[PDB]
């Protein structure tokens, strides 16, 4: 019922070879629609989902232009940050920026965000209220002050509560067939014998969307958190996702364990036991 | 749509 639009940007300095790598991606929920790669011949924001191809030349020239402006700011930032941390020019470093907005079931504005990281660590972030910033360390305090003097929060705040939401609404219209869809997982279970006295139960959940899913193992009606394996939800590569969970049980006790799943797709939350 | 024309320098 609730939707979102987010942009992820990555910039990495390549000290020994011209420009730094710059990658930008856009996402509506868990489905991607745009991309830009500094090292792509195109040097254009490109479509990555059929429902966005629709947009005319004014839209592409605008984003291309905007994303190029992004690629520049970051390029400058890597220099600025190299200085704030007083680092050598020999090693590579990474800046990451992520922003976007979430809308509710009514599709109105719920919240907006803008997070900025350095070398895989929080650097500065726009607070809940969208009027103030949070500085991870003293280096960001310099950017924090600079941004407040440049009234940078207002511009974002205007963007998030305004434009990103209004575009989020638009994209939600043009690609309904896919954006408002929900696919319950195709779930099953497997049993693999081990030791001739112990065994592994793996619980599977495939072809589901969105990517938000849950899996829990229970032992005689109690949550089994230890001795259980769980891998990060993985993409199928066709818009659907995949995820599993395993537990190690002593032999002859497989009926004590029950796998559980939660997902917008399933009308009722499932419960799975090993039958054959 | 992306934020623009450009973002602020850090």
């Amino acid at each position, epitope marked *: 019922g609730s939707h979102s639009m987010r942009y992820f940007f990555t910039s990495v300095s390549r000290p020994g070879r011209g420009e730094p790598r710059f990658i930008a991606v856009g996402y509506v929920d868990d489905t991607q629609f745009v991309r830009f790669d500094s090292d792509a011949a195109s040097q254009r924001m490109e479509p990555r989902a059929p429902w966005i191809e629709q947009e005319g030349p004014e839209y592409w*020239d605008g984003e291309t*232009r905007k994303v190029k402006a992004h690629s520049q700011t970051h390029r400058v930032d890597l220099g600025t940050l190299r200085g704030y941390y007083n680092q050598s020019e020999a090693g590579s470093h990474t800046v990451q920026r992520m922003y976007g907005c979430d809308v509710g079931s009514d599709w109105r504005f719920l919240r907006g965000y803008h997070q900025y990281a350095y070398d895989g660590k929080d650097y500065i972030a726009l607070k809940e209220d969208l009027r103030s910033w949070t500085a991870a360390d003293m280096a960001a305090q310099t950017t924090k002050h600079k941004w407040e003097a*440049a009234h940078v929060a207002e511009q974002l705040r205007a963007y998030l509560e305004g434009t990103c939401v209004e575009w989020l609404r638009r994209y939600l219209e043009n690609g309904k067939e896919t954006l408002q869809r929900t696919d319950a997982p195709k779930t099953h279970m497997t049993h693999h014998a081990v030791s001739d006295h112990e065994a592994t139960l793996r619980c599977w959940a495939l072809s589901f969307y969105p990517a938000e899913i849950t899996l829990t193992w229970q032992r005689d009606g109690e949550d089994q958190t230890q001795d259980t394996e769980l891998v990060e939800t993985r993409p199928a590569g066709d818009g659907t996702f995949q995820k599993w969970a395993a537990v190690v049980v002593p032999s002859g006790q497989e009926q004590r364990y029950t796998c559980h799943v939660q997902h917008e797709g399933l009308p009722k939350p499932l419960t799975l036991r090993w039958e054959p | 749509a992306l934020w*623009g*024309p*450009d973002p602020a320098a850090a």
Partner: T-cell receptor
Amino acid sequence: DAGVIQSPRHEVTEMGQQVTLRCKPISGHDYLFWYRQTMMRGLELLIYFNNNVPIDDSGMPEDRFSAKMPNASFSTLKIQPSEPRDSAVYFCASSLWEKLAKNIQYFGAGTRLSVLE
Amino acid sequence: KEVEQDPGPLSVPEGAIVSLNCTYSNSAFQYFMWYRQYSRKGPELLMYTYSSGNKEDGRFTAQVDKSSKYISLFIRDSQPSDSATYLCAMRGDSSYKLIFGSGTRLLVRP
């Protein structure tokens, strides 16, 4: 009190030559804009820089026009070769990110360019 | 990317209220400002607005009806000193490139 400085303010010249219009932005500003105003067409943005790199030049005529900023405090608008249809008033402007967000631009005194056959 | 504005010249007697206005046909615009230009001199920013709304700033009042793609500037207690050419300008969030109107000449009689 030291604003944008364009140069020269008046230029009367004969076609088939290289006219050079200069502009010095307000020290501290890192966006520079070139505009022209022909009485019969109004204000047109020719081009604008950010940190010295041409960001938008859709306004530039396809050929015979060339702008550039070798440094933060100097931009050049060259027209070669001079033609009458190019005579007009050329303005320059500089500004900053916090100021542009409110569409504030500091304009120069302009340069009246008259090109004669 | 077109902006329409009547050139005037429009005359009004000192002390009256006069309305200037432009219209546009690109929904991408969301920044609207008004410049004032005296003959043989440069343009001076007067009012600026973002999206729809009415902004007061002393004797000036800027308005913008996004539904109608119509912008207006009101000048109260017109003074002969207000005589000049008025230009509107706008843009989107894609570039700092401003698009101007041909301008409306104003002449407030003393």
